[PDB]
């Protein structure tokens, strides 16, 4: 029961600081789980100096 471990296929660096990360395949309904959990953490909990 190791589920589906995906393969990062595309690292499209459009700029020096803007990227597209394409990651397939995931078990059905895990794209949203991972994408939203990340998006939330990145938006509202990453530390920095401002």
């Amino acid at each position: 029961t190791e589920f589906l471990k995906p393969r990062l296929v595309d690292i499209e660096q459009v700029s020096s600081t803007h990227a597209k990360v394409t990651l397939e395949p995931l078990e059905r309904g895990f794209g949203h789980t991972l994408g939203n959990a990340l998006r939330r953490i990145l938006l509202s909990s990453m530390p920095g100096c401002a």
Partner: peptide, 13 residues
């Protein structure tokens, strides 16, 4: 990913 992993590590066992 390292942040979420750490929170789940506390309760993965």
């Amino acid at each position: 990913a390292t942040i979420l992993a750490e929170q789940l590590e506390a309760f993965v066992d």
